[PDB]
Amino acid sequence: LAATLAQAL
């Protein structure tokens, strides 16, 4: 999840 949300940046 962390890496998935990180795609926002």
mmCIF file of N, CA and C in Angstrom:
data_model
loop_
_atom_site.group_PDB
_atom_site.id
_atom_site.type_symbol
_atom_site.label_atom_id
_atom_site.label_comp_id
_atom_site.label_asym_id
_atom_site.label_seq_id
_atom_site.Cartn_x
_atom_site.Cartn_y
_atom_site.Cartn_z
ATOM 1 N N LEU A 1 0.811 -1.208 0.000
ATOM 2 C CA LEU A 1 0.000 0.000 0.000
ATOM 3 C C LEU A 1 0.853 1.270 0.000
ATOM 4 N N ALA A 2 1.900 1.299 0.820
ATOM 5 C CA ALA A 2 2.726 2.487 0.949
ATOM 6 C C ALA A 2 3.264 2.935 -0.428
ATOM 7 N N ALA A 3 3.807 1.978 -1.179
ATOM 8 C CA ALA A 3 4.377 2.272 -2.499
ATOM 9 C C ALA A 3 3.321 2.671 -3.518
ATOM 10 N N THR A 4 2.137 2.077 -3.375
ATOM 11 C CA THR A 4 1.012 2.441 -4.228
ATOM 12 C C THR A 4 0.592 3.889 -3.997
ATOM 13 N N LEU A 5 0.384 4.282 -2.743
ATOM 14 C CA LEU A 5 -0.001 5.660 -2.473
ATOM 15 C C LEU A 5 1.107 6.641 -2.850
ATOM 16 N N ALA A 6 2.359 6.229 -2.664
ATOM 17 C CA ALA A 6 3.517 7.036 -3.011
ATOM 18 C C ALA A 6 3.487 7.510 -4.479
ATOM 19 N N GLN A 7 2.766 6.778 -5.330
ATOM 20 C CA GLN A 7 2.699 7.160 -6.730
ATOM 21 C C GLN A 7 2.034 8.525 -6.917
ATOM 22 N N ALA A 8 1.256 8.967 -5.932
ATOM 23 C CA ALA A 8 0.712 10.314 -5.918
ATOM 24 C C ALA A 8 1.809 11.391 -6.068
ATOM 25 N N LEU A 9 3.023 11.034 -5.634
ATOM 26 C CA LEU A 9 4.183 11.939 -5.689
ATOM 27 C C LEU A 9 5.173 11.549 -6.783
#
